[PDB]
Structure formats: C-alpha cells, structure tokens
Amino acid sequence: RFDLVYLVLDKVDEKNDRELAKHLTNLYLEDVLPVEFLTMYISYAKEHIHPIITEAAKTELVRAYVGMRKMTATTRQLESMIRLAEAHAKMKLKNVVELEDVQEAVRLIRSAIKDKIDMNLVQTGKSVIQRKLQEDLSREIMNVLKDQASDSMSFNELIKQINEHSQDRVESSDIQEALSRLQQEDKVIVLGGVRRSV
C-alpha cells in the first residue's frame, strides 16, 4: 500500500563518514537555500498546477511496466508510476506529463525496490519448503501406519520424528501450518494433541 519504500541504511564507511563527521561539526564554526520561499513555492504549486498524461507518456508507462513484469511487478506499481509522474510534472510547474518525467518515476521506484514481492511473508525459497513439509507429513504418517500398531501418534512423537532426523530443524509452528492446510485438503484428523491418518 506504500507508493515508495526506502531502505535508509549505510554501513560504517570511512570514505563517507570522514565527510559526514566533518560536515556535522561544521555547524559550530561561526557566530542556495529558499529557507521560507520553498514552503511558499510548494503552496503555490499545490494551488495552481494540475498535470495530465500525454500520449507520448502513455507508451512509456506501458512499456516500462511490461519491462518490470518481464523482469515481479503488481499493478500497484503502475498506479504508483502514474501518480509520481504527475508529481514530477507538478514539480517544474509543467502542468503536462511527458517521457522525461516518466523516466524519473521509474528510476526512483527501481532505486526503491531493486536498490517475489513477498506477499503473505512468503518467499520462493520457503514455499518450496512448505510443500516439502506437506510431503514429509504424508510419508512420515504412512510409514508409521505400516510399521506401528496405530494410524495416530502423540505430537511429542511427531516432533520426535520430524524435528530429530528428517530435515534441517523445522519448528512446531511450521508443522501446524502444513498440517492445517492438510486438514483443509482432508488427509489427516486432528483431535483435541492427537493426530490420525485418513
């Protein structure tokens, strides 16, 4: 829902910090900057200037969104580009949106995101893991149904099959996720601590 997200981060870096420390202490040494006229310039721009998309802007807004979709870009990115390219035409007081404004709207977004969009806190290299955990529950319960005198086992003995030697260490919350999505698919019954095969 945010139009831009900035990672405002830097490392410890002498070739910056030698400047920054020498800049920060530069303030204490004495007894172009529109220091009020900027907020008045902003106010007059907000009063007077109202941009519009040109046909020569449209072809680029589409082409750049296609490039980002080929590269990984929800339509919220195109809505962000449209509104930023308007603001970048309202700046310069231009009242008309053009190729030269659109290319900064992209370059700012690329500088923000590139600097798959991680919805549901999901990642490709973690959703494959959830599918492997779903398979791990399938095999782990079938082999116990084969060898043990039950189709059910206590959750303590589930963490003491799944967490001890099956895979790199998977915590109880991931097991409960995969198992719940498998209640929705209807392949095991959870009772109360108790879990039993279909």
């Binding site: 002498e14 910090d17 030698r18 920054l20 202490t25 530069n26 204490y28």
Partner: protein, 90 residues
C-alpha cells in the same frame, strides 16, 4: 550546594565556541570509534555520539570558564564514553 549553584548559573552563560583543533581532533577519534563498532550488544558509534562528545566537551569547557578551550578538554569527554562502554561489558 548554594555556592555550587552560584558557580553553575555563571558558568552556563559563557557558551564556548569551537577552536579549529577540536573539529580536527574529534573526527580522528570518531572514525576509530566507528571502525571498532564495526568489529555484543547495541553500543555502536551513531552520529548522536558525535553530537554527544561535542555537548560533553562544551559542558567541560563551561566548568573551566573560557571563551574556547584546547583538546586537553576533549580527551576527557571521550573517557566518559569509553568508560561507559567498558561498564556495559562489566
């Protein structure tokens, strides 16, 4: 305490100003403090700690009653900070 208050009210208004060796020296410490913070808790050299060393060195300059002061001063401000970090560890 009354003579202490009477000193401080007078010591405050002197508002000492920078001398060139202070701004030259303070960066030579701050960069090393950053470089060691690169290398265990949260006690890293933020710019708030540069501003802190400035304000602390100003508070020591006020106490010795002058228009400005030499880095015989600044070296003590760095010692309060350095002793604080060694006190976080122990």
């Amino acid at each position: 305490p009354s003579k202490m208050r009477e000193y401080i009210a007078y010591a405050k208004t002197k508002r000492p100003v920078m001398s060139e060796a202070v701004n030259d020296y303070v960066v030579q410490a701050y960069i090393r403090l950053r470089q060691d913070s690169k290398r265990f808790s949260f006690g890293q050299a933020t710019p708030r700690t540069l501003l802190g060393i400035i304000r602390l060195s100003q508070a020591l300059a006020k106490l010795r009653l002058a228009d400005m002061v030499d880095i015989d001063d600044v070296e003590e401000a760095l010692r309060l900070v350095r002793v604080s970090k060694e006190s976080l560890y122990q």
